[PDB]
Amino acid sequence: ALEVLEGAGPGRLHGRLGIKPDGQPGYTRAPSPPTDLSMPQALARGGGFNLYLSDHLELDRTAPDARHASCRQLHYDLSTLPKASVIIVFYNEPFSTLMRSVHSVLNGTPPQILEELILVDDGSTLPYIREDGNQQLVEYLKLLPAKVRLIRNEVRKGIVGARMKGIRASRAPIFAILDSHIEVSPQWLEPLLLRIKEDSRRVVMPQIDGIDAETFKHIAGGIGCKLGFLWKLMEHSYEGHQTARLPPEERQPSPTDFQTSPAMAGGLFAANKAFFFDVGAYDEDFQFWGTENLELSFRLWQCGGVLECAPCSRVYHIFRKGGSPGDSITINKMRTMLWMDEYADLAWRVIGKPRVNYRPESLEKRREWRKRKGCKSFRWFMENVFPEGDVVTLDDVPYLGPLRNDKIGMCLDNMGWASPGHAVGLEYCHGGDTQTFMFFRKVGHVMPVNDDEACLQPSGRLDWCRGTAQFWWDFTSSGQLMFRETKQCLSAFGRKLRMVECDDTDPYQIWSWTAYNPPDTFTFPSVSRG
Template sequence: MALKKTPKLFKTFFHWKLWKFSIIVFVFLVFLFLLQREVGVQDFKDEAGIEPVVGKKSHVLGLVLNAMNNIKGAKPKMQIKAPIRQTKIPGERHCLPGHYTPVELKPFLDRPLQDPNAPGASGKAFKTINLNSEEQKEKQVGEEKHCFNAFASDRISLHRDLGPDTRPPECIEQKFKRCPPLPTTSIIIVFHNEAWSTLLRTVHSVMYTSPAILLKEIILVDDASVDAYLHDKLDEYVKQFQIVKVVRQKERKGLITARLLGASVATGETLTFLDAHCECFYGWLEPLLARIAENPVAVVSPDIASIDLNTFEFSKPSPYGHSHNRGNFDWSLSFGWESLPKHENKRRKDETYPIRTPTFAGGLFSISKDYFEHIGSYDEEMEIWGGENIEMSFRVWQCGGQLEIIPCSVVGHVFRSKSPHTFPKGTQVITRNQVRLAEVWMDEY
């Protein structure tokens, strides 16, 4: 009897469960309907309630309401629209057309009139002969201290000119486009116990030959000189030129650190490094900066003329051109010069064309400040002096740049037979720098 009632009870239980489930579904749907209606009403109230809060700021209210309506009516965008191209107005540019005029490229300072018979005038040799005993002693002391004839240098005017411009005609007649404009430059000159006359002749030479619109500043970096005349006396002397700054390292750290200090305070678009015993020839700066304007990753060096270390005769360029050299290196990673190969001579049509060079001497060159920072500047782990020019050469070529010599840019340099400076850690720092150069840039050499 009990077994017969079981299916009936099961059927009744099932019907009850189904009815109960239906009631739950119905209540849930009613709840959703009421909730949606409440949200819609609340949204409307919220929008309407913004006005009294915002008050007089009707413009802001309109922006907010529009944004809310845009969000509500937004539909997913399934297709990407074509970009809108903005057509440039013909003739619109950030620089003037044509070429710079001589007036625009006027030097920062006018050179005072020179006595053609003065010692070393027009870049001529000053021969120190028939000296008395006192003069002979002074000359000897100067040579021992500076490794050049400081006696002769001290008797040559700080303002001497270099005679007529003897560069090839295409260099003298070269014109420079205003667009892209020539970049400004900061001249950075590092010195350590430099002779007074050579240092200041370098500074004056820069000011007499560099266009005022391009010369941003001259930064003299003192690598912990001990000579008294390079402190207060120098500071007082350069006060007459607002464009000249002096920054100092408190302890001897060497060329690389000193150049990095100069670069850190430089404000020019390019950096131009010079040694402290140079003289700039006419029109030296514009060709360097024009090449960087044309190719911002070009690192450019002037054609370096020799200033005789005994007579201070300036080896002037020839109007007919001359055989050029370029930099190389041997397997001791020492720098040297070599004649241009035939293919490089053939590539160049005249003297205005740059010379590609595997390495450079490193004492005199210009570089875009942005590019200098992009390639990591100098290796800060290199010490005092030695190997930094080969390291920079490798760095430039392997980081998308190129090294060039610009023949129309001529700068004279006193080449000494030996360094007059001491090495705080001994001359083995040169070998250490070269080993570091190999390990960083030459892979599994």
């Protein structure tokens, strides 16, 4: 309700925030948490973080500068940089974390480059937010710059629907999407604006540091810039063996270099608004949460965009511990498979061949849009954007199906635990997903189809896949599973899994494995009719 900045200075570029006319803070900080606080409870009561502590900490909390020293040697001309609209969507975000995020942005963003701060209430039900509530939020916003504007979805629409509401309400040539439980490092916005100014086709995302949900300590982010994806359709940081496949000039980049990434971690990024809509914005038939980051990543790269990571733009993020819709996660994965072309056959089988209502009629309009825009193929994506992946073409998956030993008339069985850490069994073949395995030849990995993170080991037991010799298997021309490092072979003798000297005359070590020969085109599965 007031656009003035009284008290502006370093660490508080928008002036003293949230001060009442009488010079008192517009909210009552909480006392120190009780000494007998039961943490697993508070987390379950606080929606994934310790709210007793969050309420006690100041909204103007000072954070360590997580940037590399060389990031501070950079110069920005705030007069020539374009303005940006910061968007924070939230559903029932507690007052302390939400307002600390707002305070962090205003305190650490020069007013010259910040057009506005848009808060999107995605149908919250907490009394402190509701239109028919106690009005705490609305009352407190009057104590912040007029830049801050609140808009609401009368019904919770989800991440996509909520972000679209905010993006549409923005003015700046650039918008920046942030979480509702964050704290920024210094000069977080300047690098993003300069990068997008030079080329509006770039979608740039800050690097994400951590705030401990239990202690709220500031933690350095350990994630590199480059993110791949798993065939379960979730982003996955480049592993050691994947980083080694990069061009030698990109394996150890400077801490100030902007680095491309095939995929986006979450939803913290900046983009030119015009280009964002021309490249398809979001798929608004996505439901609530899940996979929209990968769908955007695939579409962006294929349809003329660039996804980059800015190590000099850092934002802290509270990762939940204590925790806190129907069919939404599976639907979003099916819709994302549109952009995977023939590779969708592999992803479809990995997530269990679901038969859901993915809104086919709407997905077909999205297919028409993809055609008109002239987007490139997923094969192009794998070969040019993510060529470091273990599966660049489907020929990299030569086998997919049961691993059957004819001698004992049984098949390998993950025993209902596709998670790493458990023993693999021998059971009578029934053709279900629990008994199908696939082979990634680039790494010699034997994995259950429902989890490309679990790998068979000579111990006869599953463990987390690593691109090393500890998980490298060869499937001989005679049907043997040979562990390359020890040059031994896996046997089913006595309905037990043991490693034995290789000998193709021993029928107990001869396995059959269905060849994987998927079609040139993935035909989506038919859909049927509170």
